[PDB]
PDB file of C-alpha atoms and ligand atoms in Angstrom:
ATOM      1  CA  UNK A   7      -0.665  13.992  10.154  1.00 14.05           C
ATOM      2  CA  UNK A   8       0.767  17.423   8.907  1.00 10.29           C
ATOM      3  CA  UNK A   9       3.077  17.062   5.924  1.00 11.63           C
ATOM      4  CA  UNK A  10       1.719  18.492   2.842  1.00 11.48           C
ATOM      5  CA  UNK A  11       2.366  14.953   0.886  1.00  9.37           C
ATOM      6  CA  UNK A  12       1.974  11.497   1.346  1.00 10.83           C
ATOM      7  CA  UNK A  13       4.983   9.393  -0.520  1.00 10.21           C
ATOM      8  CA  UNK A  14       5.685   7.447   2.504  1.00 10.07           C
ATOM      9  CA  UNK A  15       5.331   7.933   6.459  1.00 10.94           C
ATOM     10  CA  UNK A  16       8.697  10.316   6.714  1.00  9.98           C
ATOM     11  CA  UNK A  17       7.244  12.747   8.702  1.00 10.51           C
ATOM     12  CA  UNK A  18       4.321  11.052  10.604  1.00 14.35           C
ATOM     13  CA  UNK A  19       4.614  10.248  14.179  1.00 16.58           C
ATOM     14  CA  UNK A  20       2.324   7.488  15.928  1.00 14.88           C
ATOM     15  CA  UNK A  21      -0.530   9.992  16.660  1.00 14.01           C
ATOM     16  CA  UNK A  22      -0.602  10.880  13.044  1.00 13.97           C
ATOM     17  CA  UNK A  23      -0.837   7.645  11.883  1.00 15.45           C
ATOM     18  CA  UNK A  24      -3.741   6.726  14.664  1.00 12.90           C
ATOM     19  CA  UNK A  25      -5.802   9.634  13.349  1.00 12.07           C
ATOM     20  CA  UNK A  26      -5.559   8.285   9.706  1.00 12.26           C
ATOM     21  CA  UNK A  27      -6.835   5.073  10.706  1.00 11.09           C
ATOM     22  CA  UNK A  28      -9.166   6.390  13.307  1.00 11.17           C
ATOM     23  CA  UNK A  29     -10.724   8.415  10.431  1.00 12.03           C
ATOM     24  CA  UNK A  30     -10.617   5.408   7.937  1.00 17.09           C
ATOM     25  CA  UNK A  31     -12.392   3.445  10.666  1.00 13.74           C
ATOM     26  CA  UNK A  32     -15.150   6.418  11.337  1.00 17.67           C
ATOM     27  CA  UNK A  33     -15.668   6.614   7.587  1.00 18.68           C
ATOM     28  CA  UNK A  34     -16.596   2.735   6.987  1.00 20.45           C
ATOM     29  CA  UNK A  35     -18.652   2.390   9.923  1.00 21.11           C
ATOM     30  CA  UNK A  36     -20.326   5.498   8.617  1.00 21.15           C
ATOM     31  CA  UNK A  37     -20.561   4.326   5.314  1.00 20.18           C
ATOM     32  CA  UNK A  38     -19.954   7.977   4.674  1.00 18.18           C
ATOM     33  CA  UNK A  39     -20.982  10.010   1.736  1.00 19.33           C
ATOM     34  CA  UNK A  40     -20.347  13.485   1.709  1.00 18.42           C
ATOM     35  CA  UNK A  41     -19.527  16.921  -0.030  1.00 17.36           C
ATOM     36  CA  UNK A  42     -16.575  17.642   1.985  1.00 17.77           C
ATOM     37  CA  UNK A  43     -14.551  17.662  -1.566  1.00 17.29           C
ATOM     38  CA  UNK A  44     -16.982  19.481  -3.476  1.00 16.38           C
ATOM     39  CA  UNK A  45     -15.441  21.655  -6.332  1.00 14.11           C
ATOM     40  CA  UNK A  46     -12.288  19.660  -5.908  1.00 14.03           C
ATOM     41  CA  UNK A  47     -10.344  17.699  -8.205  1.00 14.00           C
ATOM     42  CA  UNK A  48      -7.691  14.857  -7.697  1.00 12.93           C
ATOM     43  CA  UNK A  49      -5.698  14.470 -10.886  1.00 11.11           C
ATOM     44  CA  UNK A  50      -4.397  10.636 -11.407  1.00 10.83           C
ATOM     45  CA  UNK A  51      -0.844  10.819 -12.976  1.00 10.93           C
ATOM     46  CA  UNK A  52       0.005   7.336 -13.708  1.00  9.50           C
ATOM     47  CA  UNK A  53       2.785   6.264 -15.614  1.00  8.89           C
ATOM     48  CA  UNK A  54       1.802   2.597 -15.855  1.00 15.46           C
ATOM     49  CA  UNK A  55      -2.240   1.766 -16.130  1.00 14.43           C
ATOM     50  CA  UNK A  56      -3.352   0.545 -12.880  1.00 13.92           C
ATOM     51  CA  UNK A  57      -7.143  -0.207 -13.093  1.00 11.22           C
ATOM     52  CA  UNK A  58      -7.416  -1.371  -9.106  1.00 12.29           C
ATOM     53  CA  UNK A  59      -5.853   2.224  -8.374  1.00 10.98           C
ATOM     54  CA  UNK A  60      -7.830   4.225 -10.628  1.00 13.66           C
ATOM     55  CA  UNK A  61     -11.074   2.550  -9.420  1.00 12.38           C
ATOM     56  CA  UNK A  62     -10.094   3.026  -5.581  1.00 11.85           C
ATOM     57  CA  UNK A  63      -9.630   6.964  -6.059  1.00  9.52           C
ATOM     58  CA  UNK A  64     -11.842   7.714  -8.743  1.00  8.26           C
ATOM     59  CA  UNK A  65     -14.501   6.018  -6.139  1.00  9.63           C
ATOM     60  CA  UNK A  66     -12.582   7.740  -3.389  1.00 10.59           C
ATOM     61  CA  UNK A  67     -13.401  11.084  -4.303  1.00 10.28           C
ATOM     62  CA  UNK A  68     -16.913  10.856  -5.671  1.00 10.53           C
ATOM     63  CA  UNK A  69     -17.602   9.553  -2.306  1.00 10.36           C
ATOM     64  CA  UNK A  70     -16.333  12.976  -0.619  1.00  9.59           C
ATOM     65  CA  UNK A  71     -18.223  14.915  -3.476  1.00  7.51           C
ATOM     66  CA  UNK A  72     -15.365  15.582  -5.493  1.00  6.01           C
ATOM     67  CA  UNK A  73     -13.765  14.035  -8.684  1.00  8.99           C
ATOM     68  CA  UNK A  74     -10.568  12.520 -10.036  1.00  8.24           C
ATOM     69  CA  UNK A  75      -9.519  13.039 -13.436  1.00  8.16           C
ATOM     70  CA  UNK A  76      -7.500  10.594 -15.404  1.00  7.11           C
ATOM     71  CA  UNK A  77      -4.323  11.233 -16.917  1.00  5.74           C
ATOM     72  CA  UNK A  78      -2.510   8.497 -19.164  1.00  3.60           C
ATOM     73  CA  UNK A  79       1.054   9.391 -18.942  1.00  2.71           C
ATOM     74  CA  UNK A  80       1.932   6.554 -20.901  1.00  2.61           C
ATOM     75  CA  UNK A  81       0.473   8.412 -23.897  1.00  2.00           C
ATOM     76  CA  UNK A  82       3.620  10.865 -23.699  1.00  2.00           C
ATOM     77  CA  UNK A  83       7.069   9.393 -24.961  1.00  2.00           C
ATOM     78  CA  UNK A  84      10.217   9.907 -23.597  1.00  5.31           C
ATOM     79  CA  UNK A  85      10.947  11.956 -26.809  1.00  6.56           C
ATOM     80  CA  UNK A  86       8.094  14.374 -25.643  1.00  6.55           C
ATOM     81  CA  UNK A  87       8.594  14.390 -22.052  1.00 10.79           C
ATOM     82  CA  UNK A  88       8.130  17.613 -19.997  1.00 15.18           C
ATOM     83  CA  UNK A  89      10.441  18.421 -17.027  1.00 18.10           C
ATOM     84  CA  UNK A  90       8.859  17.231 -13.768  1.00 16.16           C
ATOM     85  CA  UNK A  91       8.962  21.079 -13.014  1.00 15.59           C
ATOM     86  CA  UNK A  92       6.897  21.920 -15.984  1.00 14.30           C
ATOM     87  CA  UNK A  93       4.476  18.991 -15.387  1.00 12.42           C
ATOM     88  CA  UNK A  94       3.976  20.330 -11.921  1.00 13.80           C
ATOM     89  CA  UNK A  95       3.351  24.012 -12.436  1.00 14.40           C
ATOM     90  CA  UNK A  96       0.994  23.285 -14.937  1.00 14.45           C
ATOM     91  CA  UNK A  97      -1.036  20.750 -13.016  1.00 16.66           C
ATOM     92  CA  UNK A  98      -1.041  23.035  -9.596  1.00 17.95           C
ATOM     93  CA  UNK A  99      -3.310  25.608 -11.401  1.00 15.87           C
ATOM     94  CA  UNK A 100      -5.984  22.910 -12.210  1.00 19.88           C
ATOM     95  CA  UNK A 101      -6.202  20.561  -9.458  1.00 19.90           C
ATOM     96  CA  UNK A 102      -6.591  20.515  -5.646  1.00 18.13           C
ATOM     97  CA  UNK A 103      -4.269  17.544  -5.504  1.00 18.64           C
ATOM     98  CA  UNK A 104      -2.215  14.682  -7.381  1.00 19.52           C
ATOM     99  CA  UNK A 105      -2.383  10.881  -6.998  1.00 21.37           C
ATOM    100  CA  UNK A 106       0.942   9.725  -9.132  1.00 20.84           C
ATOM    101  CA  UNK A 107       1.771   6.076  -9.691  1.00 22.81           C
ATOM    102  CA  UNK A 108       5.357   6.163 -11.089  1.00 24.62           C
ATOM    103  CA  UNK A 109       8.099   3.870 -11.825  1.00 23.75           C
ATOM    104  CA  UNK A 110      10.624   5.275  -9.791  1.00 22.34           C
ATOM    105  CA  UNK A 111      10.255   6.808  -6.627  1.00 21.08           C
ATOM    106  CA  UNK A 112      12.432   9.993  -7.201  1.00 21.01           C
ATOM    107  CA  UNK A 113       9.702  11.317  -9.770  1.00 20.04           C
ATOM    108  CA  UNK A 114       6.685  11.037  -7.233  1.00 19.02           C
ATOM    109  CA  UNK A 115       9.368  12.990  -4.946  1.00 18.90           C
ATOM    110  CA  UNK A 116      10.128  15.703  -7.429  1.00 17.57           C
ATOM    111  CA  UNK A 117       6.190  16.213  -8.251  1.00 19.02           C
ATOM    112  CA  UNK A 118       5.640  16.808  -4.678  1.00 14.18           C
ATOM    113  CA  UNK A 119       8.776  19.146  -4.036  1.00 15.41           C
ATOM    114  CA  UNK A 120       7.749  21.567  -7.393  1.00 17.95           C
ATOM    115  CA  UNK A 121       4.137  21.560  -6.556  1.00 20.03           C
ATOM    116  CA  UNK A 122       1.894  23.602  -4.222  1.00 20.52           C
ATOM    117  CA  UNK A 123      -0.692  20.951  -3.795  1.00 24.12           C
ATOM    118  CA  UNK A 124      -0.868  18.035  -1.982  1.00 23.47           C
ATOM    119  CA  UNK A 125       0.822  14.946  -3.816  1.00 26.23           C
ATOM    120  CA  UNK A 126      -0.086  11.498  -2.878  1.00 26.12           C
ATOM    121  CA  UNK A 127       2.013   8.387  -3.966  1.00 26.03           C
ATOM    122  CA  UNK A 128      -0.442   6.270  -5.430  1.00 30.65           C
ATOM    123  CA  UNK A 129       2.691   3.511  -5.916  1.00 28.16           C
ATOM    124  CA  UNK A 130       5.822   3.861  -6.483  1.00 26.70           C
ATOM    125  CA  UNK A 131       9.065   1.280  -6.472  1.00 29.63           C
ATOM    126  CA  UNK A 132      10.332   2.043  -3.054  1.00 28.71           C
ATOM    127  CA  UNK A 133       6.995   2.666  -1.185  1.00 30.45           C
ATOM    128  CA  UNK A 134       3.222   1.875  -1.138  1.00 29.12           C
ATOM    129  CA  UNK A 135       1.750   4.112   1.617  1.00 28.84           C
ATOM    130  CA  UNK A 136      -1.841   3.598   1.011  1.00 30.00           C
ATOM    131  CA  UNK A 137      -1.406  -0.164   0.928  1.00 30.28           C
ATOM    132  CA  UNK A 138       0.117   0.007   4.391  1.00 28.79           C
ATOM    133  CA  UNK A 139      -3.048   1.913   5.604  1.00 28.54           C
ATOM    134  CA  UNK A 140      -5.029  -0.116   4.413  1.00 29.68           C
ATOM    135  CA  UNK A 141      -3.488  -3.337   5.817  1.00 30.39           C
ATOM    136  CA  UNK A 142      -3.559  -1.525   9.276  1.00 31.89           C
ATOM    137  CA  UNK A 143      -7.325  -0.924   8.808  1.00 33.42           C
ATOM    138  CA  UNK A 144      -7.879  -4.606   8.535  1.00 36.20           C
ATOM    139  CA  UNK A 145      -5.579  -5.620  11.157  1.00 36.52           C
ATOM    140  CA  UNK A 146      -7.281  -3.435  13.403  1.00 34.43           C
ATOM    141  CA  UNK A 147     -10.817  -4.538  12.450  1.00 32.39           C
ATOM    142  CA  UNK A 148      -9.560  -8.174  13.108  1.00 32.97           C
ATOM    143  CA  UNK A 149      -8.026  -7.877  16.353  1.00 36.39           C
ATOM    144  CA  UNK A 150      -8.992  -4.939  17.873  1.00 32.56           C
ATOM    145  CA  UNK A 151      -5.706  -3.377  18.331  1.00 32.71           C
ATOM    146  CA  UNK A 152      -2.419  -3.054  16.603  1.00 33.65           C
ATOM    147  CA  UNK A 153      -0.053  -2.976  19.387  1.00 34.35           C
ATOM    148  CA  UNK A 154       1.414  -6.414  19.645  1.00 32.17           C
ATOM    149  CA  UNK A 155       0.249  -7.910  16.209  1.00 29.95           C
ATOM    150  CA  UNK A 156       2.781 -10.312  15.038  1.00 30.15           C
ATOM    151  CA  UNK A 157       2.632  -9.942  11.491  1.00 29.04           C
ATOM    152  CA  UNK A 158       4.688 -12.149   9.016  1.00 31.89           C
ATOM    153  CA  UNK A 159       5.524 -10.956   5.923  1.00 29.59           C
ATOM    154  CA  UNK A 160       6.598 -13.971   3.668  1.00 24.83           C
ATOM    155  CA  UNK A 161       7.880 -13.189  -0.372  1.00 23.48           C
ATOM    156  CA  UNK A 162       9.887 -10.613  -1.687  1.00 24.22           C
ATOM    157  CA  UNK A 163      11.467  -7.488   0.221  1.00 25.06           C
ATOM    158  CA  UNK A 164       9.310  -4.867  -1.885  1.00 24.25           C
ATOM    159  CA  UNK A 165       7.523  -1.639  -2.034  1.00 24.54           C
ATOM    160  CA  UNK A 166       4.666  -3.133   0.234  1.00 21.10           C
ATOM    161  CA  UNK A 167       6.924  -4.564   2.759  1.00 22.24           C
ATOM    162  CA  UNK A 168       9.026  -1.501   3.236  1.00 22.33           C
ATOM    163  CA  UNK A 169       5.854   0.493   3.893  1.00 22.22           C
ATOM    164  CA  UNK A 170       4.454  -2.381   6.630  1.00 23.27           C
ATOM    165  CA  UNK A 171       8.064  -1.669   8.071  1.00 23.11           C
ATOM    166  CA  UNK A 172       7.732   2.119   8.188  1.00 23.41           C
ATOM    167  CA  UNK A 173       4.436   1.778  10.079  1.00 22.60           C
ATOM    168  CA  UNK A 174       5.432  -1.083  12.320  1.00 23.96           C
ATOM    169  CA  UNK A 175       7.164   0.655  14.699  1.00 21.24           C
ATOM    170  CA  UNK A 176       4.808   3.391  15.029  1.00 20.74           C
ATOM    171  CA  UNK A 177       1.844   1.243  15.580  1.00 20.02           C
ATOM    172  CA  UNK A 178       3.564  -1.494  18.044  1.00 22.73           C
ATOM    173  CA  UNK A 179       3.439  -4.089  15.222  1.00 22.62           C
ATOM    174  CA  UNK A 180       6.163  -6.869  15.890  1.00 24.16           C
ATOM    175  CA  UNK A 181       7.272  -8.229  11.897  1.00 24.11           C
ATOM    176  CA  UNK A 182       8.994 -11.205  11.119  1.00 24.10           C
ATOM    177  CA  UNK A 183      10.023 -11.280   7.925  1.00 23.96           C
ATOM    178  CA  UNK A 184      11.040 -14.095   5.168  1.00 23.55           C
ATOM    179  CA  UNK A 185      12.687 -13.356   1.808  1.00 22.74           C
ATOM    180  CA  UNK A 186      14.884 -15.391  -0.685  1.00 23.12           C
ATOM    181  CA  UNK A 187      18.750 -14.399  -0.316  1.00 20.61           C
ATOM    182  CA  UNK A 188      19.379 -11.195  -2.032  1.00 19.58           C
ATOM    183  CA  UNK A 189      15.732 -10.124  -2.171  1.00 21.05           C
ATOM    184  CA  UNK A 190      15.946  -8.630   1.313  1.00 20.28           C
ATOM    185  CA  UNK A 191      14.616  -5.252   2.361  1.00 19.68           C
ATOM    186  CA  UNK A 192      17.140  -2.486   3.530  1.00 19.23           C
ATOM    187  CA  UNK A 193      18.780  -3.407   6.866  1.00 21.83           C
ATOM    188  CA  UNK A 194      17.809   0.249   8.090  1.00 19.31           C
ATOM    189  CA  UNK A 195      13.871  -0.338   7.822  1.00 22.75           C
ATOM    190  CA  UNK A 196      14.010  -3.588   9.653  1.00 23.54           C
ATOM    191  CA  UNK A 197      16.200  -2.360  12.306  1.00 23.51           C
ATOM    192  CA  UNK A 198      14.195   0.604  13.014  1.00 21.55           C
ATOM    193  CA  UNK A 199      11.115  -1.769  13.121  1.00 21.95           C
ATOM    194  CA  UNK A 200      13.140  -4.087  15.243  1.00 22.08           C
ATOM    195  CA  UNK A 201      12.107  -6.856  12.436  1.00 24.21           C
ATOM    196  CA  UNK A 202      12.811 -10.320  13.152  1.00 22.59           C
ATOM    197  CA  UNK A 203      14.372 -11.717   9.577  1.00 25.46           C
ATOM    198  CA  UNK A 204      14.876 -14.974   8.078  1.00 19.17           C
ATOM    199  CA  UNK A 205      15.472 -17.000   5.322  1.00 16.79           C
ATOM    200  CA  UNK A 206      13.060 -19.921   6.363  1.00 17.24           C
ATOM    201  CA  UNK A 207       8.807 -19.107   5.544  1.00 15.47           C
ATOM    202  CA  UNK A 208       8.289 -21.422   8.409  1.00 13.27           C
ATOM    203  CA  UNK A 209      10.191 -19.710  11.052  1.00 13.17           C
ATOM    204  CA  UNK A 210       8.618 -16.004  10.074  1.00  9.88           C
ATOM    205  CA  UNK A 211       5.448 -17.504  10.103  1.00 13.08           C
ATOM    206  CA  UNK A 212       4.996 -19.728  13.371  1.00 14.65           C
ATOM    207  CA  UNK A 213       2.541 -18.464  15.862  1.00 15.85           C
ATOM    208  CA  UNK A 214       1.840 -15.063  14.215  1.00 18.54           C
ATOM    209  CA  UNK A 215      -1.402 -13.342  13.995  1.00 23.64           C
ATOM    210  CA  UNK A 216      -1.026 -12.772  10.543  1.00 25.33           C
ATOM    211  CA  UNK A 217       0.915 -13.983   7.533  1.00 28.86           C
ATOM    212  CA  UNK A 218       0.985 -11.750   4.268  1.00 29.22           C
ATOM    213  CA  UNK A 219       2.404 -12.015   0.922  1.00 31.96           C
ATOM    214  CA  UNK A 220       2.068 -10.508  -2.722  1.00 31.68           C
ATOM    215  CA  UNK A 221       3.552 -11.237  -6.023  1.00 34.95           C
ATOM    216  CA  UNK A 222       7.146 -11.686  -6.538  1.00 38.79           C
ATOM    217  CA  UNK A 223       9.531  -9.818  -8.568  1.00 37.63           C
ATOM    218  CA  UNK A 232      12.799 -19.087 -13.964  1.00 39.00           C
ATOM    219  CA  UNK A 233      15.427 -17.354 -12.105  1.00 38.75           C
ATOM    220  CA  UNK A 234      13.182 -15.654  -9.959  1.00 40.06           C
ATOM    221  CA  UNK A 235      10.532 -18.414  -9.433  1.00 41.70           C
ATOM    222  CA  UNK A 236      13.636 -20.689  -8.440  1.00 43.90           C
ATOM    223  CA  UNK A 237      14.743 -18.781  -6.057  1.00 44.79           C
ATOM    224  CA  UNK A 238      11.133 -18.709  -4.279  1.00 43.01           C
ATOM    225  CA  UNK A 239      10.777 -21.924  -4.047  1.00 40.20           C
ATOM    226  CA  UNK A 240       9.022 -22.961  -0.771  1.00 45.02           C
ATOM    227  CA  UNK A 241       7.511 -19.248  -0.014  1.00 45.28           C
ATOM    228  CA  UNK A 242       4.283 -20.042  -1.348  1.00 45.74           C
ATOM    229  CA  UNK A 243       1.602 -19.251   1.226  1.00 44.72           C
ATOM    230  CA  UNK A 244      -0.686 -22.047   0.944  1.00 43.97           C
ATOM    231  CA  UNK A 245      -2.591 -23.831   3.123  1.00 43.69           C
ATOM    232  CA  UNK A 246       0.101 -26.123   4.586  1.00 44.29           C
ATOM    233  CA  UNK A 247       2.001 -22.608   5.853  1.00 43.84           C
ATOM    234  CA  UNK A 248      -1.801 -21.213   7.000  1.00 46.83           C
ATOM    235  CA  UNK A 249      -1.700 -24.182   9.812  1.00 48.48           C
ATOM    236  CA  UNK A 250       1.686 -22.373  11.219  1.00 49.06           C
ATOM    237  CA  UNK A 251      -0.096 -19.236  12.301  1.00 49.71           C
ATOM    238  CA  UNK A 252      -1.695 -19.049  16.114  1.00 53.97           C
ATOM    239  CA  UNK A 253      -5.387 -20.170  15.767  1.00 52.43           C
ATOM    240  CA  UNK A 254      -6.762 -16.727  15.238  1.00 48.23           C
ATOM    241  CA  UNK A 255      -4.333 -15.868  12.581  1.00 48.35           C
ATOM    242  CA  UNK A 256      -5.229 -14.544   9.312  1.00 48.49           C
ATOM    243  CA  UNK A 257      -3.847 -14.152   5.750  1.00 49.48           C
ATOM    244  CA  UNK A 258      -3.471 -11.209   3.961  1.00 50.64           C
ATOM    245  CA  UNK A 259      -2.361 -10.330   0.109  1.00 50.31           C
ATOM    246  CA  UNK A 260      -2.243  -7.529  -2.005  1.00 49.77           C
ATOM    247  CA  UNK A 261      -3.532  -8.895  -4.945  1.00 50.84           C
ATOM    248  CA  UNK A 262      -3.657  -9.843  -7.593  1.00 52.67           C
ATOM    249  CA  UNK A 263      -2.763 -13.154  -6.976  1.00 56.97           C
ATOM    250  CA  UNK A 264      -0.344 -15.337  -9.119  1.00 54.88           C
ATOM    251  CA  UNK A 265      -2.101 -18.616  -8.108  1.00 55.93           C
ATOM    252  CA  UNK A 266       0.591 -21.275  -8.179  1.00 53.37           C
ATOM    253  CA  UNK A 267       3.054 -19.122  -7.176  1.00 51.03           C
ATOM    254  CA  UNK A 268       3.251 -16.530  -3.980  1.00 47.47           C
ATOM    255  CA  UNK A 269      -0.549 -18.351  -2.797  1.00 45.89           C
ATOM    256  CA  UNK A 270      -3.468 -20.627  -3.758  1.00 44.66           C
ATOM    257  CA  UNK A 271      -7.037 -20.107  -4.777  1.00 42.74           C
ATOM    258  CA  UNK A 272      -7.373 -22.053  -1.332  1.00 43.41           C
ATOM    259  CA  UNK A 273      -5.799 -19.688   0.793  1.00 44.24           C
ATOM    260  CA  UNK A 274      -6.928 -16.113  -0.951  1.00 43.73           C
ATOM    261  CA  UNK A 275     -11.024 -17.482  -0.354  1.00 45.83           C
ATOM    262  CA  UNK A 276     -10.465 -19.930   2.307  1.00 44.59           C
ATOM    263  CA  UNK A 277     -11.597 -19.088   6.246  1.00 46.86           C
ATOM    264  CA  UNK A 278      -8.239 -17.671   6.953  1.00 46.69           C
ATOM    265  CA  UNK A 279      -8.270 -15.088   4.563  1.00 46.35           C
ATOM    266  CA  UNK A 280      -9.014 -11.254   5.065  1.00 46.64           C
ATOM    267  CA  UNK A 281      -8.038 -10.437   1.568  1.00 46.08           C
ATOM    268  CA  UNK A 282     -11.153  -8.994   0.327  1.00 47.40           C
ATOM    269  CA  UNK A 283     -11.587  -6.721   3.595  1.00 49.82           C
ATOM    270  CA  UNK A 284      -8.310  -5.860   2.838  1.00 53.44           C
ATOM    271  CA  UNK A 285      -8.891  -4.391  -0.351  1.00 51.79           C
ATOM    272  CA  UNK A 286     -12.188  -2.647   0.648  1.00 52.48           C
ATOM    273  CA  UNK A 287      -9.890  -1.028   3.027  1.00 55.33           C
ATOM    274  CA  UNK A 288      -7.823   0.711   0.367  1.00 55.29           C
ATOM    275  CA  UNK A 289     -11.033   2.799  -0.347  1.00 56.08           C
ATOM    276  CA  UNK A 290     -12.031   3.749   3.208  1.00 57.37           C
ATOM    277  CA  UNK A 291      -8.305   4.349   3.782  1.00 57.97           C
ATOM    278  CA  UNK A 292      -7.972   6.531   0.448  1.00 56.71           C
ATOM    279  CA  UNK A 293     -10.931   8.692   1.358  1.00 59.24           C
ATOM    280  CA  UNK A 294      -9.350   9.154   5.002  1.00 57.98           C
ATOM    281  CA  UNK A 295      -6.218  10.381   3.345  1.00 57.65           C
ATOM    282  CA  UNK A 296      -7.538  12.472   0.667  1.00 57.42           C
ATOM    283  CA  UNK A 297      -9.891  14.331   2.951  1.00 60.24           C
ATOM    284  CA  UNK A 298      -6.873  14.871   5.194  1.00 58.68           C
ATOM    285  CA  UNK A 299      -4.933  16.454   2.516  1.00 59.33           C
ATOM    286  CA  UNK A 300      -7.424  18.293   0.204  1.00 59.43           C
ATOM    287  CA  UNK A 301     -10.226  19.537   2.594  1.00 58.77           C
TER     288      UNK A 301
HETATM  289 MG1  LIG B 401     -10.277   6.897 -20.037  1.00 55.44          MG
HETATM  290 NA1  LIG B 402     -19.969  14.089 -10.857  1.00 53.27          NA
END
């Protein structure tokens, strides 16, 4: 991968995605600990706190011999907010990279545009590249290859689905999407992934290698009636099929404890893989 930043997979081809995935796999197998990033610091610019992401990135930097400094931007109100360019021009003088969690993707795009150092989108309303990488490593580990895998997404057409759809054609995934009416993902992402779309969760899941869901986002809950990925829906997958879920889970809503901790679940390997892929990304952009 050669873009300076990782806001999504815009400038990535299949070879570049594979390299990142190959590196993550190698780092995991080696339980890698090193000093590749010694003397380097990653700024965590979170507009909204995220314990899970903070943990992943702080641990990732420490494993590579560097550090992550936490910048709780929520502490600065709109009445005291600095233009994004000022934030970028100041940080670039102190850190080697910026990992941002923003409310609006436009913000991280602006941060990357104005900063000379690498900017990683830890999470935005439009995309979640880091999650997608962890999801692919997980699928790769489970099935031995990604090309031809049939992955069914049942739920909201959100940032996670967007990135899954974007990497889909780069890895040869056969995605099937099921969302309630009005909660669908952009037509373009779907067509470019040549994804199957339907409003019926059963149709999307039938015979799939994996069922993937995540939190939804009384009216909302009513619209998602029947989209819960429970033990029964998991029975529609092929025998070797598995269950994935970003976490945390809203039990009783998009899934159940049985599903998350059941024999088909790979949820926690999926979680762990966020560490290995973050290390791969950080080493690649910051070394
Ligand atoms: Mg603190
Ligand atoms: Na240290």
